[PDB]
Scaffold this active site. Sequence first.
Site, PDB file in Angstrom:
ATOM      1  N   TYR C  54       0.828  -1.198   0.000  1.00 50.36           N
ATOM      2  CA  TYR C  54       0.000   0.000   0.000  1.00 50.36           C
ATOM      3  C   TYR C  54       0.865   1.253   0.000  1.00 50.36           C
ATOM      4  CZ  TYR C  54      -2.757   3.887   1.599  1.00 50.36           C
ATOM      5  OH  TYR C  54      -3.346   5.124   1.718  1.00 50.36           O
ATOM      6  N   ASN C 403     -14.035   6.493   3.445  1.00 47.51           N
ATOM      7  CA  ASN C 403     -12.954   5.626   3.900  1.00 47.51           C
ATOM      8  C   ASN C 403     -12.481   6.004   5.297  1.00 47.51           C
ATOM      9  OD1 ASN C 403      -9.559   5.592   3.765  1.00 47.51           O
ATOM     10  ND2 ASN C 403     -10.617   3.636   3.475  1.00 47.51           N
TER      11      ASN C 403
END
Lengths: 511, 511, 511, 511
Positions: C54, C403
């Site tokens: 990520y 998110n």
Amino acid sequence: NPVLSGAPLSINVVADIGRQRLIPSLTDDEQVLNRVHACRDVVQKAVRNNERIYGITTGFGGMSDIPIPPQHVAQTQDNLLAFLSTSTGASLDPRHVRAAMALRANVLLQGRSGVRLELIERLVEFLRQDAIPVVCDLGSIGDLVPLGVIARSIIGHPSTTQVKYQGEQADSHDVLQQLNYSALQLEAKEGLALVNGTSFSSAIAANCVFESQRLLSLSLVLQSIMVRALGGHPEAFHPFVDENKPHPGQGWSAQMMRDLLAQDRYSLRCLAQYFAPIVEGIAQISQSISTEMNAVSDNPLIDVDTGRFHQSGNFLGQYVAMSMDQLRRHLGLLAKHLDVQIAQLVAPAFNNGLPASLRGNSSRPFNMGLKGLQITGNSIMPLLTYLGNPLTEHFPTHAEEFNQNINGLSWGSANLAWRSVQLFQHYLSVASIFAVQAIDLRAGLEGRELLGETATELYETVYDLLERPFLFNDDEQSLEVDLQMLNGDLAGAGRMHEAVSSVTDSFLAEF
Amino acid sequence: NPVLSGAPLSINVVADIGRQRLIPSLTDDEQVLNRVHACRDVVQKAVRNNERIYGITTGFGGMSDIPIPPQHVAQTQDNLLAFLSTSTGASLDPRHVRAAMALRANVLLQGRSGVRLELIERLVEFLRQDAIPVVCDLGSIGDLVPLGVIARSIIGHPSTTQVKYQGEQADSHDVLQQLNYSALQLEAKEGLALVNGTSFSSAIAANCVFESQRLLSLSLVLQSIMVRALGGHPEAFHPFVDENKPHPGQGWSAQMMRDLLAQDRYSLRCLAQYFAPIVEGIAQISQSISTEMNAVSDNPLIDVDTGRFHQSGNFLGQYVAMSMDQLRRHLGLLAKHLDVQIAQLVAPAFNNGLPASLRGNSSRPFNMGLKGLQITGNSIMPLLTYLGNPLTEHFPTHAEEFNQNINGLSWGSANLAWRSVQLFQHYLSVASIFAVQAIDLRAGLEGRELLGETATELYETVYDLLERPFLFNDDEQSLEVDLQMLNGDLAGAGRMHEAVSSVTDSFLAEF
Amino acid sequence: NPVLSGAPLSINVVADIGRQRLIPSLTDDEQVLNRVHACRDVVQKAVRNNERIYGITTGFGGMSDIPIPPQHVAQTQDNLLAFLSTSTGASLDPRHVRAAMALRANVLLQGRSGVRLELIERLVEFLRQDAIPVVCDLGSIGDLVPLGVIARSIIGHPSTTQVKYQGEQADSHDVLQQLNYSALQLEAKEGLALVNGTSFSSAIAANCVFESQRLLSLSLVLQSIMVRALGGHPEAFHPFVDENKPHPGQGWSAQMMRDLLAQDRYSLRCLAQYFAPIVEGIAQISQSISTEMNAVSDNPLIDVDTGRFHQSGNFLGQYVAMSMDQLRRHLGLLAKHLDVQIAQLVAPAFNNGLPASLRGNSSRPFNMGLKGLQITGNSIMPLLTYLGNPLTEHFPTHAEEFNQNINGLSWGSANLAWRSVQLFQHYLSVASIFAVQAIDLRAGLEGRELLGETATELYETVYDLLERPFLFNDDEQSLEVDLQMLNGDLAGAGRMHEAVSSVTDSFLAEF
Amino acid sequence: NPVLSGAPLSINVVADIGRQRLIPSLTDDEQVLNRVHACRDVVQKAVRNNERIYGITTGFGGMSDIPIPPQHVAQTQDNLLAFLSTSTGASLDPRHVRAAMALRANVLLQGRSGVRLELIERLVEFLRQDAIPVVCDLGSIGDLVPLGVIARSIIGHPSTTQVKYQGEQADSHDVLQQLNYSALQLEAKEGLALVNGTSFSSAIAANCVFESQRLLSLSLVLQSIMVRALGGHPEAFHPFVDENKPHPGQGWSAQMMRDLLAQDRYSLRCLAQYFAPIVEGIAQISQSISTEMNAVSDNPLIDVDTGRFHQSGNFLGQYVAMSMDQLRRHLGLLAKHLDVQIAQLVAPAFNNGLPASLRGNSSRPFNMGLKGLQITGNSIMPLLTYLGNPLTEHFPTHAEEFNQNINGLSWGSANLAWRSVQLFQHYLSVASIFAVQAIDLRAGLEGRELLGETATELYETVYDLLERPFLFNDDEQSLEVDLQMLNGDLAGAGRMHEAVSSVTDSFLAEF
């Protein structure tokens, strides 16, 4: 007794229906019932041709993307009441439930919701028979669940509710049988039309507004009594002062003080200026709540003059939420002004000659007249001021699968406002005892001889409720019993509200 | 069964005494009772020599400038209870009253208040006989009036109180006679020593803290279940993450999540970081409330080792007020995190494959599984967040003839905290149903097979309480009944608290 | 001068770096720099093998579902700083920016973020050269945008920032050239590692905590002066009183009052009990902020001892948000206690013989000594009490494409806390003038002759700052100039903080 | 250019005087100036006969028990300005000071305050010459100190103030000399009449109301643009929907949406219902602030038709305080609705086909279009929602020797409201960028082709201000520069306010 016909109702009539002082009757006007029948006919025609319409043939709010086949249409409505049976918390005051039933019947009588007339008749008959569903105070964000309790109660839905009837709580099916009603299967849009509105929030708000108008009048009369007990100068309420600051609230408050009655402290000298925004805000909230409770809040709005279905957002109770936040602020400010006045009344530095803590007998050196009572007031008032904080700002944006990203929380706000009303009733019992004792002590130093007609009437009502200066020795009475009596009066028969009814009528006529 | 001897008590023991799961017993230790007798002897000697001491021979708080002649000294104490009889509002939970009686007896047993031992014995015997005075929730600013209710109940004061005994509510005199007690006349300082403390506020706060510890543990287990239902990645709880952010709360929360279980959303991935301040704050509040409730809060502190009287301000409950404000904040934040997690669980955009609104049956196209339940949660959570606002800041500076210009309002704050506890119990019933349904649906897509031991135990406890995926068709059950069952369990027997007792014990051992 | 090596820093050192009283130096320890190099090597190896990680090879928070091809990896980092250039509002105090730069360099020096050492060197050199980026106060929910301003400033990013250097504000490119630095292109994860933490919120919070410790000490000394001016009884601070209520804050506060110095009013008699929760809460907040600011808040945590990447939520600043809410509460309560004490000091009903409004000359009948000053204090204090409301509860659950459904708002909370600090500095200037005038008038009725060493030192510092009872005739000075002098001292050189440094050191040693 | 004659002013004219878009002129009407002269004559006659009148011959608020001998009468007024020189904090926006000077001159022109005409002339001439005193934001509880700054500036009082003139800040004496004015010695009641009112609070509130009306119009137009970008259904704004819920705000909002443009989510479908209370509340606040700012707030009210002095409480600014609390609530709710709409616009689950985070180019896989911008909005909006908390409830009851036991805190509330206005201007810059980008992306999927006339005008104004879909690659611009440009426009020239002037005019005409 009021007739329900879909015409707008006053907050007074709604509160009296909630209080069982008025028995609603269903209208016999041909035009109203014909409009209701025509609306149901429009719904029937939409079902027969399998027209795609939200609620009737689609899913509900977040799951409206799922079509519903025709054979299940009616079932869908019943199923709605099944999954809305999520009411929990403390039980609501039955006044709120009566007012909500009356308001919902009145809304449905306007012929925009597509209900059968028999549902409205069942609502009205439950109200007339005093078969009031038990509704709890959690489940709505501003009214599917609280109104679903009433709908399930009146149709005999298998999701059993609790209904209070003839003084006993029973299953909705038992009460239905006692009323000679059978179980009712909902047609298209009917279950949605019973619950998709702001009627319950509006009912709680209407009760709060009725009580708040009465409590404002009582606060003003108690303030006049305290000002007279302090020996305050009426110069603060000369017409010239409000003439040069033409707030309508200030003018009305100064006129009321003139009727009821180097420089005084501000709680006395600036009393009308302090009251002005509270008076005007209470009037504005009354008007807005009255507008909301008489509106058709159903989402699919049916126009029978064109036979059309209109998507609506009239179920959103943002206005009720904000008005109830403001009303809680107003009650908190009234309570704080009264607490400041009482603090003036008990302190010999500011008494202008009254005994410390308003003790009645100076011969007993250990008498502490109303010290504990002042502590009780000091414990109640900050709760009201704290409830002045707004709830609407905390509204959830993720509610109901993110579909209800604006809701309002009018239900929670209105229940908080009713909590404020109860707290202020207790507080006004405290303030009434303080006012009566203070005016008796002032009369002794120089009670009814110092007071005008309305203030004398309130003083005599307080004396008669307590079966009677007012307090002489600390051990000669229990102030708890007196507080209970005054609070029960304010919550029940309202003899103190009758004693100040001239001020309440003046406020209603002016605003 | 605990022995009351003036030694510090744990919040667990106080809550279990309040819950009637423990019966307090008065100590037989010679040193403790001898110290109590010596303190009463110091008071007697001060009365005999007509020594000028506050409370004994002077007026009370705002009227302490008025001396009291010796012959009236005892009367003064009785008169205190007469003018403190100003308790109104809703009745308190009897758990609070039991805890307050136990805490007050324990405080008086430390031998600093100058009471007769017989008063402590009457308190303990009322607690043992389950003769619990009815106390209302208004009257204190942080405890003369609420504690005065208990004092009047146990001495048979003419200001009659209401006492619940043998399941029936009666006059304090009737209960006194049934307990074979006669009316008691207070000696010097005794009436003041019974009411001049923070014991009632501390008792409500101790009950709030006990419940909040259990609710934090239950929230954490429900969060683990929801994280498993979302298919969340356990990578968020690797030891390396909390090792590099060494908040004790974060470490304990991550260890608990490890035991219980491109990137996840924050409500899952930042769960331990979100929990950390709540865990540590709850621990701090527990410690501070435990310190406050075991302190001697009486104003005239008598030292028998020197025979001296000390003026004190230990009756001020500012710490309790601020701790309860913080605890309400913690409950609101837990509720909001759970609501965010549920909003994730119901929305297919974030479900990771779960059905919309967690509907159990896809064959019925009109099933709306837990939509109304989510609305109920969305109505409850903002009330807790709103109660996160502090009350201590609104404290009255004019209280009690301007003598109590700082008070704190610990009483109101603690009652608000208990309101938060009740709201969060309802909310956790909602969240438990959501967690069980979500984990069942996740198991079907890939319930107990996905869960660890503690989470499986909680899941099975929920299944057994509701007598049973969990929900298949909307019309096959009433969620109201399930919510009532789970809420009654959390408020009563606490089988769900037993199911997560390992987490609660871990929290107690760590903090 | 402090050495930055990744070891934990004290809030004192962070505040002194922010205040330019300490110049940070980069460590020469071989182990620390070798760990930094090894972390960068792990990042390089992950890039070379095209490992899916990520941030390095994926999108960012809400768009992490989009893969990034290897050739764009480095560009991605630069592009991050391009889209985070959304900083607006009022400019921050440069102390916050200096503290944030020092804290970020210290965090990166722990070898978990994978940055090049040259970035840390540029941060440290910008701090040493006093080239401080201009950062505005809006853009973070608890630190991509405020930290991105610093990153763009130190790397010469094309999204130009404003940097204050050599007393002049210039473009980041001009300052870079003046520092003989060239534009720097970010490698993998470096741009994310510079901005993905709580360092800026922690820096503002550390400055707030440092100031709040000093302001608590100053408040306590001013309270002792006011208590002496009122002729308060030291009996309230006898060791026996705090011995029987063993809150650590109460014990330390009573010991401080003992050092510095029928019944008094509560603001005097319950002073230690009122202070106790504030003292302990400030200590707890200090510890928690110190823990947060020394933690590694980067999301991809690299362990070089295993060469692993760990997903993290350590960038969440919930603890900072809640601690800053609590700190604002503490400042508000200190201000309200001081305002109550001043109200006591100005009113002859409670003066115990002091002149009304603390007027200095009775010969001029129209002297109104500190009436306007009291009004100024009464205008400042409620702002602090209002800022006692929490911001964390309002956190957005829809943030960043849903998110970041939990964030915390530590940035806004810390900026509010700094606003509280500024308001309380103004308020303490007002309170210092009140204390000095009151003690001079008390000495005249019976200034330095009545005061202990620390209080005398503070009194003399106030007299010297204002170049000088303190006020005799209203027209002989302008209190605005004195307030400006005292506020500039508190904000700048801190001679008043030096005068009470013994109390601050005692608080640090105890807590 | 407006003529000041004591006649009521509109909030528009007050704001334009504050903005230097209008130059006030003193009236030449004989009746107005003759009334002013007669009022001064009444004051002179009261002084000559040594009549006992508050302020003229007595002490001030808390010390009015002290008589003042005749020879000191004039001195007393000067001395007032000496002890009110306690202004501190951040400097106010000069718009507030200009508006306050204009409002105070207008109030004094009504002939109730007893001032000399030359004082009004000096006020008007300072305003015309743009010699604006520097006034700080602390010192008033609702206006002795902030108005005293202006009075000292215009009379050349020895308590020197700072005056901005010809672009430079100088001493009040220097500016006085540059204006060819000499120092002025106050006559009886003149100093009190200059400062004893709500003019400064009313001026700040009038600026807040003007800005809030414009910001409401801009919010509505941006909402229409966002609704069009989401492809929202105009069915929500059919006349039938508001016809059945006849809130005036809802009707006007629905008419505006109709002009500007299974079911949509609530932020779109319930938009008019959400707006209704905000629109009506803003109208009510406008009316109340306009009434307050045009009232005579001086305490000794002189009636020249009878030659009498009236004690007044018209200086109390409770209404301004409560109105500003409500206005902050309205701004917070507007911001939260916009944030919910933006969260809809950025999430592909709710985009209805728009790119994630409104990224402009899909070819660059690492483009994160407006993610940081959304974070900036998410950081700004909760500050406004937090400022929705009321300040009036925290008013000090001990203020000014307990004489001002009710004040209101209108000064602090109005300054908070201006803080809300600034925050909402920044937020609306963010929202404008979001709206323009979203509508461009929607046009590309199916900008000005989708918009009506007013929305097209706003879109073109935004495009021209930024010198220009709107955003294509993240590295092609700096959003900070665009935000600064839009915020400077909203704070300055207001081209965006001109672009939506039709909606603002419609709101003014309707309400």
